[PDB]
Design a protein around this ligand. Structure first.
Ligand SMILES: NC(=O)c1ccc[n+]([C@@H]2O[C@H](COP(=O)([O-])OP(=O)(O)OC[C@H]3O[C@@H](n4cnc5c(N)ncnc54)[C@H](O)[C@@H]3O)[C@@H](O)[C@H]2O)c1
Ligand SMILES: NC(=O)c1ccc[n+]([C@@H]2O[C@H](COP(=O)([O-])OP(=O)(O)OC[C@H]3O[C@@H](n4cnc5c(N)ncnc54)[C@H](O)[C@@H]3O)[C@@H](O)[C@H]2O)c1
Ligand SMILES: O=c1ccn([C@@H]2O[C@H](COP(=O)(O)OP(=O)(O)O[C@H]3O[C@H](CO)[C@H](O)[C@H](O)[C@H]3O)[C@@H](O)[C@H]2O)c(=O)[nH]1
Ligand SMILES: O=c1ccn([C@@H]2O[C@H](COP(=O)(O)OP(=O)(O)O[C@H]3O[C@H](CO)[C@H](O)[C@H](O)[C@H]3O)[C@@H](O)[C@H]2O)c(=O)[nH]1
Ligand SMILES: [Cl-]
Ligand SMILES: [Cl-]
Ligand SMILES: [Cl-]
Ligand SMILES: [Mg+2]
Lengths: 345, 347
């Protein structure tokens, strides 16, 4: 009726989105099981506790797992939701290939359970966290929504594609459902306040947090996974997108659902690709620190270059990413410098 | 001393497979929730009660849903399974397109749960019921295992494809798993005793049972779904395979698992395609009755022709579909004639 349910809202993208929702006047209800979120000193996960402080608005939260039908039932009885933004899931941490069942359980079974409860309670409006990984090895660049999908390299990406397909099927079968599938490119950056940001545990698998950790002195040097691709400089190229813009894209998705759009799919990227070395350099500039690097072997399954065609999202969702490279680096640096250990110990 | 778990064992293919298993010396434990199986006068589904009589061997059975985590866990705890043959699932009554979530829950989440429970109990040998539908609209024929998969039309076929992908990944990640994915073509026929067979509830959605129902005099005429396809006679072409041969292919699969085979995928078909009209004619011959029919509109999603390339199975599985068209028709007829209304509890 009123509320927006946000699954996995304590995570990186989700917490930034909760913040945007609150500032836009929405009332979110967040759920998370702390699988990859840090527990604050109170009820709320630290990220959310900080979002509350930042917005001066309260965060309604419930600790729970999407795999728990009982809890889902109780949740859906307690609140009247008008839409669900689904961030909860396991992300490839490079782990996927080795633990397929965990991925398929959490991402597939958990999403199906969510979809079923939504259907049961008549909440047929969803915004889903998809990924450019669904396009597989790029056939052409930039990647537009019409590029082929499926034929993924890993259990994680396959999981994303399977979910998109299930949702398409659901929308076909029941014309009352509205779903916006958002294919994120490479999220980076952090809220301008520097109070929240990505909080990886252990050695980061993604570039940016590793880069930021070298700059802060936590890591000796960045290992660059190959310099022999068919890219202007030999290193992998990606469409780095500021998490704040990404979060704002979810609000635009909400408005889209109101149009009774059925199933729509949009890329959420800037359309500008940057190489590993370019990112390193920009981080040196932002941080004022040196970021030593070593060229190592190619990482299994890595693609040479991946970047988005942002046209459709601009035309249909009315959204474009506003923040550039320098801004992403400055914000990421601020978060890292201001929070040397992430959210806590 | 180790058993074989048979999920969905009370159904068409499963009952036939339980019979083959019993005859070949295996010890099955069968589970079914009666979603699409008839309850016997006793605890056993009628089909399995008959299999017990036919074989003179006991059938260990538990009424249970694969979606029931607690029950499934207790089952794996109670027995020491050496392998699992997974038949349980929803097939479609042309329904899948309209109830996607049901297919995704029962087929997809049900199998993920089964695989998790299996892993947890140290059982990593699986025989999975797949289908030629995973190939989608044929890009060429005959369909060999190398033909592209995915790109299916309905939720049912998508579920099967997603399951195959999941198992392939599992095997890739853990070399200790062994899994045989069998892509069945169009199973037909019945055990030669005539005591068991396909037992549809209501108007049959598949060809053969409808034809037999007409031949027995229950139905007026066969409705032929389109006659304008690009095939010899305009009617759809399919690779019909005798359920007994299909069932025996499961025994071959268990043998394959014992070879520490990893993930293997095999078509289970005869390699010979027959049209709708050719099947009617064969049924006329078996039944000794004229079988009328009327041509109606095309059935949404139907492919023109589909048939297998059965060489890989012959070679690697050491299995071949022995029974021909007449046998299939004669066996189907015997079952239908001796059991005009399908299964019923004992008198
Ligand atoms: N970060 C990326 O580069 C990226 C790229 C593409 C798509 N995505 C997708 O976007 C979504 C959010 O990504 P993120 O970077 O914010 O990751 P994240 O791990 O920070 O956020 C996911 C949140 O979900 C929660 N969660 C996990 N399993 C849960 C369960 N069973 N029940 C309830 N909560 C559960 C975690 O505790 C975490 O707080 C995910 O679906 C991710 O796969 C992210
Ligand atoms: N019949 C065909 O032409 C065909 C073709 C391709 C693949 N397959 C597959 O082979 C398998 C067997 O098909 P069949 O023709 O014997 O179908 P069937 O319906 O006779 O057999 C399936 C059995 O599974 C049981 N079942 C369903 N949901 C269950 C659940 N949640 N828990 C436990 N048991 C459950 C049903 O009661 C039934 O006895 C199915 O997975 C089917 O999709 C069949
Ligand atoms: O320590 C690192 C990390 C990354 N990179 C390079 O930086 C680029 C971006 O790498 P990320 O890992 O941040 O992101 P990806 O776009 O390559 O995404 C891939 O890696 C993600 C993080 O591992 C997820 O696993 C995701 O499923 C998978 O598609 C790539 O060219 C990568 O080779 C390095 O050189 N060194
Ligand atoms: O009453 C019937 C039934 C079938 N047929 C035709 O007979 C052939 C075999 O049809 P079946 O339904 O027995 O088997 P299929 O292999 O064609 O499978 C198709 O039907 C399945 C069950 O009927 C599912 O619907 C599946 O999605 C779909 O591909 C097809 O050419 C079909 O058009 C008829 O003319 N009339
Ligand atoms: Cl696993
Ligand atoms: Cl953009
Ligand atoms: Cl549904
Ligand atoms: Mg061959």
């Amino acid at each position: 009726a009123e509320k927006v349910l946000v699954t996995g809202g304590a995570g990186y993208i989700g917490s930034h989105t909760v913040l945007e929702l609150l500032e836009a006047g929405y009332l979110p209800v967040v759920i998370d099981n702390f699988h990859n979120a840090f527990r604050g000193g109170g009820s709320l996960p630290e990220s959310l506790r900080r979002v509350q402080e930042l917005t001066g608005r309260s965060v309604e939260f419930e600790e729970m797992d999407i795999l728990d039908q009982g809890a889902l039932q109780r949740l859906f009885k307690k609140y009247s939701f008008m839409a669900v933004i689904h961030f909860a899931g396991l992300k490839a941490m490079g782990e996927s290939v080795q633990k397929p069942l965990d991925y398929y359980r959490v991402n597939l079974t958990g999403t199906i359970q969510l979809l079923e409860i939504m259907k049961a309670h008549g909440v047929k409006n969803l915004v889903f966290s998809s990924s450019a990984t669904v396009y597989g090895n790029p056939q052409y660049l930039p990647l537009d929504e019409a590029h082929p999908t499926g034929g993924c390299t890993n259990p994680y990406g396959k999981s994303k594609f399977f979910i998109e397909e299930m949702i398409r099927d659901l929308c076909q079968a029941d014309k009352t459902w509205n779903v916006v599938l958002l294919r994120y490119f490479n999220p980076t950056g952090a809220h301008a306040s520097g109070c929240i940001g990505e909080d990886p545990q252990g050695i980061p698998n993604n570039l940016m947090p590793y880069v930021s950790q070298v700059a802060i002195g936590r890591r000796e040097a960045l290992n660059v996974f190959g310099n022999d691709y068919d890219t202007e400089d030999g290193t992998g190229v990606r469409d780095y997108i500021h998490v704040v813009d990404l979060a704002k894209g979810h609000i635009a998705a909400l408005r889209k659902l109101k149009e009774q759009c059925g199933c729509r799919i949009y890329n959420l990227g800037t359309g500008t690709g940057y190489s590993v070395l370019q990112m390193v350099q920009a981080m040196e500039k932002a941080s004022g620190k040196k970021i030593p690097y070593k060229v190592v072997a190619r990482r299994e399954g890595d693609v040479a270059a991946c970047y988005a065609n942002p046209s459709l999202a601009q035309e249909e969702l009315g959204w474009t990413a506003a923040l550039g490279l320098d801004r992403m680096c400055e914000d990421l640096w601020r978060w890292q410098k201001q929070n040397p250990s992430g959210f806590g110990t």
